[PDB]
Amino acid sequence: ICVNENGGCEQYCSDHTGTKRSCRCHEGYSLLADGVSCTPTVEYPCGKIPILEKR
Amino acid sequence: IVGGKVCPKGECPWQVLLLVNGAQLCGGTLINTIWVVSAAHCFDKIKNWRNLIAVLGEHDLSEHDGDEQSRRVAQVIIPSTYVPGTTNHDIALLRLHQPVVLTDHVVPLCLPERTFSERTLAFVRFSLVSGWGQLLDRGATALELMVLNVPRLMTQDCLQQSRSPNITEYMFCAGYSDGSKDSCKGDSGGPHATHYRGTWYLTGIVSWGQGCATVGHFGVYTRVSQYIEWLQKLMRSEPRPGVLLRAPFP
Ligand SMILES: Nc1nccc2cc(N[C@H]3C(=O)NCc4cccc(c4)NC(=O)CCCc4ccc3cc4)ccc12
Ligand SMILES: [Ca+2]
């Protein structure tokens, strides 16, 4: 599953036994209930530019 | 950086300036509040290991605006496979004595997981390279942080398109062969940052090349994806006496 289009994950992908796929996020992010998107849990998450994020 | 533009202040918040005795040494990339990724060759001629400073939130070297944060470098970790004065395994992991405080101007770049970087990030054509290096080959270095957008090449395509050291599996080629745009020796250790779905990731390190923006040649970058596990394990370790540490690779 992870091998095709990153398993649909916005960040990290993990394959499990069977058809099972888990998406994961970098520290400073949490996985949304869609099971694919990552949302910041902190004010300054890695790889986001605050001056552009704010405007 | 040759043929780029000034990076608008705060638009490269992961950029690090490395100083030795207050003098510009190299670039680096902040990956969290304690750790910086840079190039191993940057440390080949260091004797004053206790006078290494990493500056975060820097933009303009002629003025202090209050956004800059300075930290003494406590450790410089280099792979056992790197040989001073050569090209391969050109990576250094730096531990800051104390954490930096994240602000609008100081933010780490995401250190990706290996598989995601190999399977997804490796195929994003363009990435940003940045630094206060040479504005021209044998020219003055920049006073304001510069940034350049460069396209990545498969090594087979790079070798074919180029007019010399080997381009190994621990490296990748990026840039242009027309002598117009490239990172230079003063940008060494700086980030090669890749955008993917609203987030920026560390995919490369300014490493080496044949003179800045030389026709028939591309810039060579350290393939960070090969070092993810090596970096992750070292970031979990306790520091050791002495600044320089050679750590076994793999
Ligand atoms: N994109 C790019 N395009 C063109 C040229 C470029 C040159 C770069 N760096 C320079 C540099 O840092 N020169 C000072 C230096 C200090 C300590 C050790 C070495 C070089 N190593 C060598 O000279 C022996 C290996 C080979 C090597 C050659 C040049 C370099 C690094 C390594 C970096 C990026 C470049
Ligand atoms: Ca300044």
Other residues' Cβ atoms within 10 Å of the Cβ of residue B173: 24
Place of tokens 């970031």: B235
**Alpha carbon distance B50, B230 (integer Å):** 25
* Side chain identity at residue B205, one-letter code: I
Q: What is the resolution of this structure in A?
A: 2.1
DSSP annotation of B188 reads T
Give which of B61, B51, B74, B55 is closest to B15, Cα–Cα: B55
Ligand 1 mutation pick, B91, B164, B170, B188, max ligand atoms within 8 A of CB: B188
Name the catalytic one among B38, B90, B105, B207: B90
Burial (CB count <10 Å: 0-12, 13-18, 19+), residue B56: buried
Asked if domains B1-12+109-225 and B13-108+226-239 share a fold, the reply is: yes
Pairing mode, if any, of strands A12-15 and A21-24? Answer: antiparallel
**Alpha carbon distance B91, B74 (integer Å):** 17
Place of tokens 């933009």: B59
In this structure, what CATH number is given to the domain that contains residue A11? 2.10.25.10
The verdict on A53 touching B (C-beta cutoff 8 Å) is no
**Alpha carbon distance B14, B9 (integer Å):** 12
**Alpha carbon distance A53, B20 (integer Å):** 34
**Alpha carbon B208 to chain centroid, angstroms:** 11
- Which A residues, 13 through 32, put their C-beta within 8 Å of a C-beta on chain B? 13, 26-27
- When the candidates are 3.30.70.20, 2.40.10.10, 3.90.550.10, 1.20.190.20, the CATH number that belongs to B1-12+109-225 is 2.40.10.10
In this structure, which residues have their CB less than 5 angstroms from ion ligand 2?
A: B 60
Pocket of ligand 1 (CB under 6 A): B 41, 44, 85-87, 182-185, 188, 206-209, 211-212, 219
H or E element that contains B116: helix B114-119
Cis peptide bond N-terminal to B250, omega within 30? yes
Q: Which CATH architecture has domain B13-108+226-239?
A: Beta Barrel (2.40)
| Tokens linked to B155 | 């090594």
| Residue B110 bridge partners (DSSP) | B201
Q: Are B3 and B184 in contact (CB under 8 A)?
A: no
Say which experimental method was used. Answer: X-ray
Q: What's the number of domains chain A is made of?
A: 1
The residues spanned by each domain of chain B are 1-12+109-225, 13-108+226-239
- Domain holding A42, by residue range, is 1-55
The residues, ordered by sequence, that sit 6+ positions from B205 with a Cβ below 8 Å of its Cβ are B29, B37, B38, B39, B90, B91, B189, B190, B191, B192, B221, B222, B224
Nearest residue of chain A to residue B104 (CA atoms): A50
| Tokens linked to B90 | 């050109």
Q: Are B38 and B205 in contact (CB under 8 A)?
A: yes
Residue nearest (by alpha carbon) to ligand 1 atom 5: B209
